[PDB]
Subunit: 415 residues, 4 copies
């Protein structure tokens, strides 16, 4: 009768590079990347934990975590230990050991056992902190204890051709995992439905004392690369009992989401498309749902302003999403998503543009098919999206034509 | 050396009904009326207190105050007594007396002397809670002490004909008040510039001790209507020293405000105009200033959205102010201000509209020169502003052509 | 799978005066009464809701509420609606009606249906706010929906001699209530265990829809006294399905509580006894347990201080519980519980004393078997507990010999 | 007219290792050392900033900051940027440079120019975070600008032989600094009272623009050890204007403090001394002052409890300071100070003990002249303070008899 999230501690791994996001993560880790005009990427796993009733959260950080920690400090600050809530920000530092470096995602939880065990949670929900998805974790916990499993793994059931980019769980008729392959060219199919492969989300449920034992065992193994997926996961499927849990059984979908929503926005094209899709009439992710809300760090911000309307000038937004503190001054917006603080100035135009917080758009500047990094000041009259060769030289251009624009690229500019 | 705001308590009087706002205050006191897509009216005086360094605030409520109290409870919740901060919400109820209703602005402070005295503030800053203005109260505090006055009164410098609607202080050359007149037919001019009169803002500065005795003297006097402006200040300008502080000395102007800003929006016209004026290219009030910020109760809200762009319908806003969680779906907005939560649907038109939170605009409606009440659902196909006689029979239509539209009115409608 | 508390709203009735507590509730309703150097009495039901996972709480107020409301405002302030948390403080006032008074416990929920229904919780948990107990309401919820009952009523399993003063539920072998008796002289027996009676705690679980219906029907019935225990529930035990829930099945006990703990401290002696019992070596209530914590309003307070140790005076405490901000200066404490802020000065003696916050004990004062009200200043040399006739004339003395001491009594004393 | 603290940013340096505190700072930096059952050492400079009206605070950490940062995260979490308040926690990390270790106190400001400049504070208040004192920084702010100084330096007025351990400022008749000596064997006396010397508090006030220049010149200089007291100030006294501000001009003393209070608790003896002095009848520091309060991280804690009172044992405290969540069970306390969470058990005796949080005192243990580290479990029957050579072998024993006791030493124990 007691919900099991009472006794659970969610541990978010937020050291992920997002190196495939190129300059988008040169000054911040992928979990700190803004998304959706809504939150940072990490806020989803944290919000999933919170709405699932997990009141103990630890966050392991590493790669350039100042922005990330600064965000966690100010957004996730409403846990009080007298209420058996806790939010531990757990960077790598010269604390319990010199290093200043986690040996791997397993070592991120190893070095901080002395923070976990004073809480003594019954279960530990290990989460990747770099995906955008909503999911009730109480379903995984119940399946975990009922099945007697040694580890329950969150899995996407996706068509097999797309599963070639994932780590894939080979599974029997009982959804017990019997093998794990990293990025198979021909992924094993689900028995009885071979067109789909089970695709690891990086979400692992254990019994805490079990994980602590398996985790110290890995800390002493020199064969181990100190990775959950590559070391902890294979040992248990081989010697213990690992059961896959399918994302669709615990996904939390609003009435306006036609299918379970999951995005890893690993590439520039993936990130741009996941954001620009929200300007659809019927987007795949409902950012206006209040049933499974996404908590984030937010400030009181003035509303958005649209100014000028004559023969030469008009500030307006069509097929677009516009956050607060955005002054659209004589600028024409179309199929674009703007975070807070954007200043778009007269005669400028934005199209297919994902504009991160506090960007300025100078007069006459015209930008199409772009991701504009936080705080970029676009010079007056700059054209992006007309000349592919000149665009590829000046900025990071994907093969599909999306230009990522950072301030370091703008500083380097002439003709 | 020390700033005097350290030892000041701001006491906001927020019981005023605001009856000239008609049905706009039928469910809420005027200090709780939304304004500017920015805050409630009360928040300005409260934020002037905050920004002036006054960390002890009391608010007297009375007239329909649940909405008011709930906003105060959820927005102004960051004061801790261990830091010598307090925020007291003081409604008339069954506490120190039966009654359950203050008999005036002076009674509103007098009944709560047992709340003030334990704080023992050196100074009292009595504030009208129903006006929109920015002011650094520390200037008034310096002049009150340096002047040795018994009461210091904040006054607007106004052309005399406009002063006909105010309480007016007659002063000598040294800005010492010699007389007070309520709505003088011919207002006494300022010496040396007889083109202007001193119009009282409802802001008084006392020594707390001098104040306490004056209230006690007021509560024993049966000639007194228990009113600060009618009974407390007249007595002092007669038998003691009452000096006038000019708004322009203390007003906080951002670099984008061409003159000191003060509105009382006491009429549906004045309210609509002040809101609509924020849609100007260069507005008189700069709601994007951060140097003198307006705190209010804000929640995390999704951004604004504009959808549809075909030959027949296009969602967009021009010369407009739009708040978060507004979905503008195939609807046209022009010179309109929208608060949070508005749903405007296909082929509807807004012009010169002030739209309060959570209003739904049905398909094909066309509204012009309107103030729409909070949460109002506008039926599909409604027309306002085309037929003055039709509009006046259905809604509170002003002589100037503004229609105040409540859900009470909508519910009564056929043709 | 999902815990039912997610879909519940706890509604706490905190209007009861507690008139048998006499002067102790002359200025504050019983739920606001301090208890245990721990919290106020209402802080047990609210924490049960919190710890049980109920995130929406309403508090119905009425009798002398200013202290209670100020406490809820400042202590219970960590709920944000974006997380679908809410804490509504709902006093009787000119809101949806003139009244300024609820007509009964049922009416207190009736007049606030417009607060409940926007939340649309699936279940209402109606709670008395004047008892000291720990309880996990998730148990009653799942019992409620699996039994199909129209009401699930929390009941104490007590010796029928003790149920003399309780509203008693008459049940069968299925724990379904046949009849309700208000204070039976000889109360009915549990079938199969007639020596124990089912005593109503005043804790009701409904389906929200059904409760709304019962309450509109009760609101239109003129036979009804608009009370839960006498109108809403007796109707259902007759026409619907009413099943009793027993305290021991859902009581939250720490490993240091030998029996399920519940106290209503309805009398001076009951209140003194429950407080003074926490000075025991093995107390009934474990106020040091952290597993089902009691949240309250608490301020950073300095530690307790004990000074003086010579032949004539020694500040010390024995068999006593001493809060922070207490300075025991040359004063002797024994078997006493002191709330925060007490100053006991030289040569004074406390024995068998419950001392509420901020009391001052003057020099040479000797007090035995006392309840000292909040803020009381005990004059130098006062002797209480030596002469019963003198004590009964000066203060409120129980037949068992406890004197409750208020400041209005002290102010009236010569010899 | 406006207070200068509105335009100032406090920058606390809390990287100090406190090496002379020996094992007491093995696991924590000195600013995180508990003190006085009141707060951590860092909490005094932070509170002086807060109470002085400085709403922007930066804290530089370095040596083992995990406890420190976590304390700042959970304690100093009530600043909001939209109210022009900020609290930046700034450890040396991979952020703007590899390093992972500041080169000194000046470099700890220099490396975070990019944090301060967006705030554009007019003034910088550089504070040492490892001293216990109370001080109204607004006085320094006025002197600095009224003086036209390039840096104002807080100085203690100390008899000359005690200035032997300080950086000492040689001053002229109008308190302008003409020279600075690091630990002068014979400190330069103040002109006119040659019995006293101005000892540096490590408190500096600059104009922000001049400081950031001085930091950048310092960063380009290889002769500079990148430290404020050794490099920044010595440059200024030579080539610019440097003025002294005396601690007694601006120190905030409560009515019960006979002298300006400043302590550096730099040794085990000094640390034990300052804590144990708080058990005095009239202490030098009044921790019960509410006029200049010390904010800290505080949890809701149960009160203190004393139990047993027989022929053989009695739980009591004499001449002692006892925090909440302390259960004194059959233990005798004299002239001791206990932080929260102490558990002292039957037949144990403590005298002149400073007992840090969560310490367990086993039965029959007897300890005198003692500092017990956080969470230490003292084994039953341990005897300390009786045999110096034994104590000094098992423990870190001062020349004056104080033993600092860590769990690492208990773990190694036999006879």
């Amino acid at each position: 009768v007691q919900p099991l999230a009472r006794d659970a501690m969610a541990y978010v791994l937020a050291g992920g590079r997002g190196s495939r996001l190129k300059e988008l993560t040169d000054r911040r880790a992928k979990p700190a990347v803004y998304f959706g005009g809504k939150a940072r990427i990490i806020d989803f796993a944290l919000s999933n934990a919170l709405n699932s009733g997990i009141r103990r959260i630890g966050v392991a950080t590493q790669y350039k975590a100042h922005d990330l920690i600064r965000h966690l400090q100010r957004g996730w600050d409403f846990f009080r230990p007298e209420r058996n809530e806790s939010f531990d920000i757990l960077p790598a530092s010269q604390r319990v050991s010199e290093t200043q470096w986690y040996e791997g995602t397993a070592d991120a939880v190893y070095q901080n056992i002395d923070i976990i065990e004073p809480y003594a949670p019954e279960y530990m929900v290990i989460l990747a902190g770099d995906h955008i998805y909503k999911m009730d974790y109480e379903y995984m916990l119940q399946q975990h204890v009922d099945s007697g499993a040694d580890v329950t793994i969150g899995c996407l059931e996706v068509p097999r051709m797309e599963a070639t980019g994932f780590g894939v769980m080979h599974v029997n008729e009982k959804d017990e995992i019997i093998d794990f392959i990293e990025k198979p060219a021909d992924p094993p199919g689900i028995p009885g439905n071979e067109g789909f492969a089970l695709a690891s989300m990086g979400i692992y449920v254990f019994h805490t004392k079990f994980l602590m034992e398996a985790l110290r065992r890995d800390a002493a193994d020199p064969t181990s690369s100190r990775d959950f997926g590559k070391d902890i996961i294979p040992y248990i499927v081989e010697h213990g009992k690992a059961v896959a849990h399918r994302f669709a059984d615990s996904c939390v979908r609003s009435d306006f989401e036609h299918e379970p929503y999951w995005r890893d926005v690993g590439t520039i094209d993936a990130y741009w498309q996941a954001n620009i899709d929200l300007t659809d009439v019927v987007p795949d992710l409902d950012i206006y749902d209040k049933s499974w809300p996404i908590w984030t760090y937010a400030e009181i911000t003035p509303p958005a302003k649209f100014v000028h309307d004559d023969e030469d000038r008009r500030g307006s937004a069509v097929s677009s999403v516009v956050s607060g503190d955005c002054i659209i001054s004589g600028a024409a917006l179309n199929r674009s998503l703007l975070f807070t603080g954007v200043r778009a100035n007269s005669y400028s135009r934005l199209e297919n543009a994902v504009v991160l917080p506090s960007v300025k758009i100078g007069r006459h500047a015209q930008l199409s098919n772009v991701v504009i990094d936080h705080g970029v000041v676009i010079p007056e009259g700059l054209i992006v999206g007309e000349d592919p060769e000149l665009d590829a030289k000046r900025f990071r251009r994907t093969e599909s034509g999306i230009c990522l624009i950072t301030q370091s690229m703008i500083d380097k500019l002439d003709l």
